[PDB]
Amino acid sequence: MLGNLKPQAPDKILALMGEFGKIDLGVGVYKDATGHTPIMRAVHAAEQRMLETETTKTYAGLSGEPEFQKAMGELILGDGLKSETTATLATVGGTGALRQALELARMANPDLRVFVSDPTWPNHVSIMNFMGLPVQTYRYFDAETRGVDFEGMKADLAAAKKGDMVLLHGCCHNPTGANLTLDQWAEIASILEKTGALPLIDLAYQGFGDGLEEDAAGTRLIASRIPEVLIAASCSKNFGIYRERTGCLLALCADAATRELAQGAMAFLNRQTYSFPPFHGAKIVSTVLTTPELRADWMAELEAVRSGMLRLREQLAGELRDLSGSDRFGFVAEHRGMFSRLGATPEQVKRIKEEFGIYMVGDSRINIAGLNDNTIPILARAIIEVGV
Amino acid sequence: MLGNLKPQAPDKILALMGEFRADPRQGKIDLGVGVYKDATGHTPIMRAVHAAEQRMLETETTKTYAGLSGEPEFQKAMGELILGDGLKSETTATLATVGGTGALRQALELARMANPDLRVFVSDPTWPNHVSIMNFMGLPVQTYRYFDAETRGVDFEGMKADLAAAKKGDMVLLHGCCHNPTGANLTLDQWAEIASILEKTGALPLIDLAYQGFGDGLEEDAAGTRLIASRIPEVLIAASCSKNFGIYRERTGCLLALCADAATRELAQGAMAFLNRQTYSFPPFHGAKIVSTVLTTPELRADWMAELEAVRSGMLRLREQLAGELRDLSGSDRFGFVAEHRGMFSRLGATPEQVKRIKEEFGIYMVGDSRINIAGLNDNTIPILARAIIEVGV
Numbered sequence: 124m125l126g127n128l129k130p131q132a133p134d135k136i137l138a139l140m141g142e143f144g145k146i147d148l149g150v151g152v153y154k155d156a157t158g159h160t161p162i163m164r165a166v167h168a169a170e171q172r173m174l175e176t177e178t179t180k181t182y183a184g185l186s187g188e189p190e191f192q193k194a195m196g197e198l199i200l201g202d203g204l205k206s207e208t209t210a211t212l213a214t215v216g217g218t219g220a221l222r223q224a225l226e227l228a229r230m231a232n233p234d235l236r237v238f239v240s241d242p243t244w245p246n247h248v249s250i251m252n253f254m255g256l257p258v259q260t261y262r263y264f265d266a267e268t269r270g271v272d273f274e275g276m277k278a279d280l281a282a283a284k285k286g287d288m289v290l291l292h293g294c295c296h297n298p299t300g301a302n303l304t305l306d307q308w309a310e311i312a313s314i315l316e317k318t319g320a321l322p323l324i325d326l327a328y329q330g331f332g333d334g335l336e337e338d339a340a341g342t343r344l345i346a347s348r349i350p351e352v353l354i355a356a357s358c359s360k361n362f363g364i365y366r367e368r369t370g371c372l373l374a375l376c377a378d379a380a381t382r383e384l385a386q387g388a389m390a391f392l393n394r395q396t397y398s399f400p401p402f403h404g405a406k407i408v409s410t411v412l413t414t415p416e417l418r419a420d421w422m423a424e425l426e427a428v429r430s431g432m433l434r435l436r437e438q439l440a441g442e443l444r445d446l447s448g449s450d451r452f453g454f455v456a457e458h459r460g461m462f463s464r465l466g467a468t469p470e471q472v473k474r475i476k477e478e479f480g481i482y483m484v485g486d487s488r489i490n491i492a493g494l495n496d497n498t499i500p501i502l503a504r505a506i507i508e509v510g511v
Numbered sequence: 512m513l514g515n516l517k518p519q520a521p522d523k524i525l526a527l528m529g530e531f532r533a534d535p536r537q538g539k540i541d542l543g544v545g546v547y548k549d550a551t552g553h554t555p556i557m558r559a560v561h562a563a564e565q566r567m568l569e570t571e572t573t574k575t576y577a578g579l580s581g582e583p584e585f586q587k588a589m590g591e592l593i594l595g596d597g598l599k600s601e602t603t604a605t606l607a608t609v610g611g612t613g614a615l616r617q618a619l620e621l622a623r624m625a626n627p628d629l630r631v632f633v634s635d636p637t638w639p640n641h642v643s644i645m646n647f648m649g650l651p652v653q654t655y656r657y658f659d660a661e662t663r664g665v666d667f668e669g670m671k672a673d674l675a676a677a678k679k680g681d682m683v684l685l686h687g688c689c690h691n692p693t694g695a696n697l698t699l700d701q702w703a704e705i706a707s708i709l710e711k712t713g714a715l716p717l718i719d720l721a722y723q724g725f726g727d728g729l730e731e732d733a734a735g736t737r738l739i740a741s742r743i744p745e746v747l748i749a750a751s752c753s754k755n756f757g758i759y760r761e762r763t764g765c766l767l768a769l770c771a772d773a774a775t776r777e778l779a780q781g782a783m784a785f786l787n788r789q790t791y792s793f794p795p796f797h798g799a800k801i802v803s804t805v806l807t808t809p810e811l812r813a814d815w816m817a818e819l820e821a822v823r824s825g826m827l828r829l830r831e832q833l834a835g836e837l838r839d840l841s842g843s844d845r846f847g848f849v850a851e852h853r854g855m856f857s858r859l860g861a862t863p864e865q866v867k868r869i870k871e872e873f874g875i876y877m878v879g880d881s882r883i884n885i886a887g888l889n890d891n892t893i894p895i896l897a898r899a900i901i902e903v904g905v
């Protein structure tokens with residue numbers, strides 16, 4: 124029977140990591156100057172506290188633990204958290220949150236379509252393909268200016284219908300690094316409420332852009348305008364617990380009744396997929412978020428990380444300017460997040476990794492974190508050498 | 512849009528505990544629990560498990576993304592724990608999953624990919640979640656006779672006659688050991704006949720292995736699985752580490768796909784990794800790392816095996832006591848099955864009506880199908896349960 128299985132296409136980004144003066148600018152993980160993805164101080168302290176206070180490992184909450192649900196809701200929505208109208212589901216990483224979000228939505232609307240940014244995280248489409256959900260794209264990245272083609276985005280978004288789902292990145296857009304301003308967010312909210320489309324927000328880098336609260340400004344604005352909204356959050360990066368697989372799905376509803384419905388469907392969704400959600404990571408997160416001492420140190424380390432990447436961008440951009448006499452590459456310093464799309468065509472991108480030893484994703488997506496004073500000039504020189 | 516959601520039913524377990532907690536009776540007993548409780552009514556963390564977590568806290572230097580199908584140490588250690596020396600690496604695909612339930616869901620998805628017209632045969636009765644998942648997936652579900660409500664043993668003749676109707680490509684779900692909820696199990700000779708039926712019908716066996724070590728022993732509990740693995744070319748095994756490692760909440764499981772050849776193994780392994788990636792990308796690391804640590808560290812493995820065996824022996828002694836008590840009160844050997852049943856659960860064979868009478872009159876709570884958890888009994892509660900059963904006329 125199993126012989127009937129068809130060979131499935133592998134994950135490109137992961138494959139890139141597989142095929143690796145080597146400079147890795149692939150997989151989206153944070154790395155320090157010494158090419159290491161460390162364990163945050165607070166996270167480590169949390170685990171120690173856990174190893175000491177936990178007396179049992181029996182089954183817990185099907186939708187996650189109340190403390191985790193609360194801490195996460197507050198981190199994302201701040202004071203805009205209306206408990207009586209929000210449903211929370213602890214999931215297996217942000218990816219699990221997205222999948223659970225797509226399933227939940229399809230249950231309420233079998234005829235739903237999903238609008239995704241052009242371009243977007245390849246996994247978004249992959250999952251949607253697997254599920255067989257109709258995917259539509261909205262213009263987002265402006266290939267010339269490397270910014271956002273807002274006019275084009277608004278045009279296509281207006282074409283959405285009631286019941287359609289629009290997938291927006293809360294901040295730090297993967298793979299481009301191009302992000303909307305708060306003003307642009309307000310406009311998008313106008314379009315959404317006029318069309319009756321359900322926004323699905325992918326929040327995976329809250330804290331890597333402009334700051335913890337700042338990176339949630341957009342998500343908070345949509346939540347305040349639109350009555351029903353879905354938020355798929357990931358703790359993989361901002362907490363550095365990638366392998367623990369911890370994130371959550373928040374369902375913002377119009378009333379308590381609907382909320383009781385959503386919470387019921389969300390729980391049922393975990394039950395039929397894997398029963399209970401993984402505990403270890405969620406515990407680290409809530410422990411950190413509820414322990415003032417740990418929260419303060421976590422915010423600080425995350426701040427240090429964010430500030431550092433920001434420096435690297437200004438450094439890489441400057442190196443480029445003083446190597447071209449033109450601020451064409453200036454956008455690198457304007458982009459916010461962990462990634463940034465250079466624009467190098469497929470021809471050039473593979474050529475670079477070949478005759479330079481620097482591995483980046485085919486669409487020219489580079490991981491700023493995987494760069495330092497030593498490699499910056501090399502990358503700058505590289506893209507200058509192979510200008511076309 | 513979300514208002515168009517259909518109401519989904521609660522897990523019921525909560526509702527079961529709801530009534531229990533509201534009971535003002537000081538002598539109320541709870542035998543409906545589905546996890547292991549010790550003498551003091553606690554579900555402890557195993558010594559070896561606590562030791563592994565300390566070692567992990569000291570040696571892990573990063574939490575970066577790891578293996579999409581799980582870590583090699585875990586996949587191999589698990590494969591050896593289940594199939595022992597009979598592990599054919601060249602033809603065995605392995606996938607780390609989110610608990611045994613995740614292993615079952617993935618196995619069902621894998622089979623469906625290979626055969627859209629798949630039909631699943633489940634025992635009568637079986638773990639409720641089995642049916643729920645299949646219903647959710649919309650897969651055709653068939654039932655084969657299993658529990659003989661009269662002897663409280665296996666209705667093997669009926670099982671054979673029903674499995675005979677399975678066609679090539681159909682899936683037959685068997686409990687590797689310690690049948691949940693019944694407690695009645697197949698003998699190695701019956702496993703042999705079953706294997707013959709499967710070879711004949713061309714049905715794909717899906718073995719649910721969640722209680723390895725709670726029956727007759729670690730090796731003993733895998734006997735049937737190993738017999739199936741050697742006779743049948745394609746086999747799917749959904750293993751769980753929740754109970755036998757006491758890491759319920761960590762969500763640690765494993766899906767083993769035994770294939771006919773290397774070409775097929777690579778095909779299955781690829782499909783399995785694709786399945787994880789499309790559901791949640793990478794599987795939970797912590798629980799799996801605790802397991803691989805225990806299994807690879809000679810000191811820990813020895814201690815774990817010893818703690819598990821003590822737990823197993825403990826439950827067995829309880830079965831003997833209960834049955835002995837029941838024999839004295841009944842003046843017969845009708846309830847001898849209690850000491851024959853293996854596992855943590857046992858179906859007494861009481862009707863809902865009798866189950867209700869026991870709750871009301873004796874304050875003893877159990878699942879509506881009369882499933883009891885042997886772990887919830889002790890020298891003080893056994894006499895009470897014995898009398899309750901007899902008085903209500905089970």
Ligand SMILES: *Cc1c(COP(=O)(O)O)cnc(C)c1O
Pocket residue numbers: 151215216217218219244297325327357358359360365369370791792
């Ligand atoms: C990281 C990331 C996710 C979620 O990843 P998990 O490892 O499953 O937490 C989702 N979307 C984007 C854009 C990401 O970069």
Ligand SMILES: *Cc1c(COP(=O)(O)O)cnc(C)c1O
Pocket residue numbers: 397398609610611612613638691719721751752753759763764
């Ligand atoms: C407990 C159990 C499982 C798996 O539980 P997980 O918590 O998901 O590991 C699977 N099948 C049966 C029959 C069980 O009793």
Ligand SMILES: O=C(O)CCC1CCCCC1
Pocket residue numbers: 134136137149150151152218244246297792
């Ligand atoms: O590189 C990125 O886009 C972030 C990490 C992702 C890569 C694809 C699998 C899930 C994790």
